[PDB]
Design a protein around this ligand. Structure first.
Ligand SMILES: O=Cc1ccccc1
Ligand SMILES: O=Cc1ccccc1
Ligand SMILES: O=Cc1ccccc1
Ligand SMILES: O=Cc1ccccc1
Ligand SMILES: O=Cc1ccccc1
Ligand SMILES: O=Cc1ccccc1
Ligand SMILES: O=Cc1ccccc1
Ligand SMILES: O=Cc1ccccc1
Ligand SMILES: [Cl-]
Ligand SMILES: [Cl-]
Ligand SMILES: [Cl-]
Ligand SMILES: [Cl-]
Lengths: 162, 162, 166, 162
């Protein structure tokens, strides 16, 4: 019912995310992650810290965050343009089923949800994603969570990018 | 001597490119691809044509091209923003050695080279990349081929993004 | 048809006559990119009588702090700024202006770092009620680096008698 | 003789002040207003009280006072930071001549001059400014009054600001 008490499933192995690539966010909190494609990237072989990278792609715009495991099934993100950190958790994951992948992740501002990302690669047909959104929408600030794929730009021959 | 008669090695399997992720371009033709990270993406599970996607990331800007294999060891690109096509080839590839990956690819304007991209994930240490750049520079328009990683922006805690 | 995708492709309307800006004084920045220009009031100033270069000045006022930039017209409907404190220059443009309407003034202005937006200032004097402003912000947020653009007027310090200053 | 007996010329229309923007203070009492530029601002469109604002700008610092007309050719100020009040008068004004603008204003501690400001946009060439300063100095505490543009910071390419 409040953000700090939401579920926190274990972060799947990185390989499970990469096998899901690319995804799209079906539901998000702020406007930032509307009409967005997610790509996960393994650490560079010469990276000293071996952090993976999450790519949030909206047309010609890209938002990049290295991330690593933290306590309590957290993912600690480092914004690659600013160096600021954010602590994220997974409400649920359901990766690489025979009907594809979905998950919902979130980051808190105390008892408020500061951001929400529900990703899938199956046109939003995972029944888990429905249940999860309904729960998160009732958390403080979660009234803002909305469907993120209405009236997105037209494509020019590519399926996942525009 | 001329672009049309450069080497055309077999395109490696996609998984070889993905296992090399992420790469940087050490030598390019146009300055669009300066200070750039390359990430490859598998086709979306629901994508009708099953085209892979090359991501060309320069700080906060991303260029995306779907691609599929064509005749004569070619890759056919589809710019996701404009819908413009281009036929590309690999001069050589050397992916996933015990010293990492490098390759050089090119597209032609008849006998001149229109674009050149030499990627690696080993700080430019593959012998083959030296040989291959010197050859491509000697072709019509390869005077414009330059080292692409001079004076790039400073990072904020991420290894391969800025 | 489709929004501009990089900062270099944003619209560039004519810089209104200085006098239209001065008649809009003072304005507040509803949306900005860096945090520097949160809780900020804009005042335009004509060139001084004895100004050798006849540059106007934009004042960005945050409580008891001020940032100042001389500006002059440039090619392609640019304004070229000179930071009065550092001598740093920057080429700006207007995404739109809608000054001195029956519902007041708004505009949005920007400066690019190539294809990314480096700074963004949307000002108004009508409590953010201009529909043009809202659509301008949506377009600008979508270019590289535009995700940092944010509402700039939350949790600003308490005033002590004055409407536009604090 | 005494501050309470100084001239009190009419407050010029606000448009006359704004047409004079910007000015510098050639003489002041307190060193607070040394090396200082004056800018006048019209009331905000939605200001309920419709007070104008006087801006005192010294490098990167600014003092702001809302002001309205009051009894006896007075301007009543409201410090925007402190909420504090001052009653000021004009000793003279000489706005928008063919040689530019000048004026001198003052506020009193009874018979002592509390603060004094003489502004101009013509490098202090207005004969009226000379005579008005000479007179102000002979007032109790008017010994403090000094040429205020000695030893001011160097500029970085702007005429009226630093
Ligand atoms: O953007 C959110 C996120 C969450 C977990 C891992 C990577 C990224
Ligand atoms: O059509 C967009 C898209 C992107 C990623 C996954 C699935 C669909
Ligand atoms: O950017 C060029 C390229 C070449 C081959 C495959 C994918 C992309
Ligand atoms: O060679 C290392 C490297 C650096 C940046 C991005 C990708 C790879
Ligand atoms: O501070 C931004 C700016 C832009 C155009 C004109 C004046 C100021
Ligand atoms: O929108 C009105 C306003 C408020 C404070 C300062 C300037 C303008
Ligand atoms: O600071 C002095 C003053 C006097 C009259 C009007 C505005 C300001
Ligand atoms: O350079 C100082 C200055 C400031 C305002 C008006 C005239 C001159
Ligand atoms: Cl996520
Ligand atoms: Cl390539
Ligand atoms: Cl501006
Ligand atoms: Cl004054």
């Amino acid at each position: 019912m409040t953000c700090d008490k939401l579920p926190k499933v274990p972060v799947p192995p990185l390989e499970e995310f990469i096998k899901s690539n690319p995804l799209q966010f079906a539901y998000v909190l702020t406007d930032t992650f509307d009409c967005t494609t997610r790509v996960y990237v393994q650490p560079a072989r010469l990276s000293p810290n071996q952090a993976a990278t999450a790519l949030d792609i909206r047309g010609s715009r890209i938002i990049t965050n290295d991330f690593v495991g933290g306590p309590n099934n957290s993912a600690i993100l480092n914004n690659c343009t600013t160096g600021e950190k954010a602590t994220w958790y997974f409400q649920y994951t359901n990766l690489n089923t025979p009907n594809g992948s979905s998950y919902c992740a979130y980051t808190c501002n105390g008892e408020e949800i500061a951001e929400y990302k529900c990703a899938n690669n199956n046109n939003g047909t995972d029944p888990l994603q429905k249940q999860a959104v309904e729960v998160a929408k009732k958390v403080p600030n979660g009234d803002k969570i909305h469907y993120a794929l209405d009236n997105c730009p037209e494509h020019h021959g590519c399926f996942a990018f525009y």
